[PDB]
């Protein structure tokens, strides 16, 4: 089916932490972004759900970014764009968002990529397509 989600080859690069440190070097750290506040605890889909959300933020940010900031955003966007290879359903009504610093979002994104790196190609992420609230 087209209701599946899995990756044969690693879509997570080794030098992704570099592209995030480079973006952060030109960022105003307390720029307001959001993070889901009540994402169900699911050690399989968890980081993936937040990466999808973080990914949605990289796109929004590119539209209000300067010519050169657009490149740094896009370059971080590429590191996590693979999440769109999967038909993730729109956030549920139960999902609450909370305002946080872009530095917080970037740091978490890095962490999620690290935790996801050893499992991205071994798991079937078909059940992650529906974001859940705890």
């Amino acid at each position: 089916m087209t209701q599946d989600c899995s990756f044969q080859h690693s879509p997570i690069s080794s030098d992704f932490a570099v592209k995030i440190r480079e973006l952060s070097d030109y960022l105003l750290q307390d720029y307001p972004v959001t993070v889901a506040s009540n994402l169900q605890d699911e050690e399989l889909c968890g980081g993936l759900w937040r990466l999808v959300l973080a990914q949605r933020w990289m796109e929004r940010l590119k539209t209000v970014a300067g010519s050169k900031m657009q490149g740094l955003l896009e370059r971080v966007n590429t590191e996590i764009h693979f999440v769109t290879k999967c038909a993730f359903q729109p956030p549920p009504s139960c999902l609450r968002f909370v305002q946080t610093n872009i530095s917080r979002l970037l740091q978490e994104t890095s962490e999620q990529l690290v935790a996801l790196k050893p499992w991205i190609t071994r798991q079937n992420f078909s059940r992650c397509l529906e974001l859940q609230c705890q």
């Binding site: 690069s13 030098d15 992704f16 592209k19 370059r75 693979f82």
Partner: protein, 336 residues
């Protein structure tokens, strides 16, 4: 038989004889006796921080046969000048390489990715281009280029041959560039599988959401066992290969014939010498005692061609002397 001890060093001294059986030893130190209990046969005397006191005449008598061994333990009052070419070692901490170049005096260790120079001794941005480490001291600059196999690039219609002395570390980086991240890389030897502690994979993104993959293979210390045809294949690229030749001693293969030439001071000419030699040779173009070094450039065909042009229309014998650590060479060029 001659031992050279550098400072308060901690090393072991063992000797083995091809006959393991119920045989007994007895250590005879500097004008004093010593007891032993060895392995089956190999005997040993290990030392932690060899003081100027713990040095000199050390004998070891054995009985099945009734044998006797003797060793002269000296100290490093002498520190001879040298320039041993760079070696490579993957940092155990992360996904990055480290340049181990030895020399007396200690040299400048610079990584060059072609061109861009980055003197760091530890390289983390290993992706593509022409990567080569260079050591530079009082003696000069000796470089070790990282062997690369670009599956993304056009094939070198020569099937590359890689030579290295038994014990040296083998390093082969296989780089492949693909549009999507959906592709893998794999290493293989002619009828032999690649060891788990002989492979490492790195990956990053390029231009418009492109993916570059580095699947390098390495051998800690090579042997006859590790010599063979290695091949790299990608799950979106054609399988390109290179054969690994193990060597006992250094060599220089050049068509030495001592060639004669003649030209009139109106002609533009350069003397040439094609050679396939390992390790990288130190060359010298000498004439009527006046010696000038050479641009020992590579022809990439399967040999390096050294050239000389500053003939200054001067007539006579132009001799090219080239030599590496375990080999020498000389070619006589007559001119009229």
């Amino acid at each position: 038989a001659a031992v050279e001890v550098d400072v308060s060093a901690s090393i072991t001294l063992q000797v083995l004889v091809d006959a393991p059986g119920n045989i007994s030893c007895l250590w005879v130190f500097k004008h004093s006796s010593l007891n032993c209990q060895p392995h089956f046969g190999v005997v040993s005397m290990v030392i932690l921080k060899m003081t100027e006191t713990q040095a000199g005449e050390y004998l070891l008598f054995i009985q099945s046969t009734n044998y006797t061994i003797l060793f002269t333990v000296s100290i490093r009052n002498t520190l001879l000048y040298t320039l041993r070419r760079p070696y490579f070692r993957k940092m155990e901490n992360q996904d990055a390489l480290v340049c181990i170049s030895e020399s007396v005096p200690e040299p400048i260790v610079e990584w060059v990715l072609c061109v861009v120079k980055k003197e760091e001794k530890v390289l983390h941005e290993l992706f593509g281009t022409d990567i080569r480490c260079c050591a530079r001291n009082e003696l000069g600059r000796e470089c070790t280029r990282l062997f690369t196999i670009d599956l993304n690039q056009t094939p070198q219609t020569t099937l590359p041959q890689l030579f290295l002395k038994v014990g040296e570390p083998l390093w082969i980086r296989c780089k492949a560039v693909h549009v999507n991240h959906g592709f893998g890389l794999t290493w293989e030897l002619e009828n032999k599988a690649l060891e788990e502690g002989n492979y490492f994979e790195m990956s990053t993104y390029s231009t418009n959401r492109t993916m570059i993959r580095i699947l390098f293979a390495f051998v800690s210390s090579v042997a006859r066992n590790d010599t063979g045809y290695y091949t790299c294949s990608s799950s979106k690229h054609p399988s390109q290969s290179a054969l690994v030749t193990i060597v006992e001693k250094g060599f220089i293969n050049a068509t030495n014939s001592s060639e004669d030439y003649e030209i009139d001071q109106y002609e533009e000419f350069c003397f040439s010498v094609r050679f396939k030699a390992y390790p990288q040779i130190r060359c010298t173009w000498t004439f009527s005692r006046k010696s000038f070094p050479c641009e020992q450039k590579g022809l990439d065909n399967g040999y390096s061609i050294s050239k000389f042009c500053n003939h200054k229309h001067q007539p006579g014998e132009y001799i090219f002397h080239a030599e590496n650590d375990d080999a020498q060479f000389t070619k006589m060029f007559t001119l009229n």
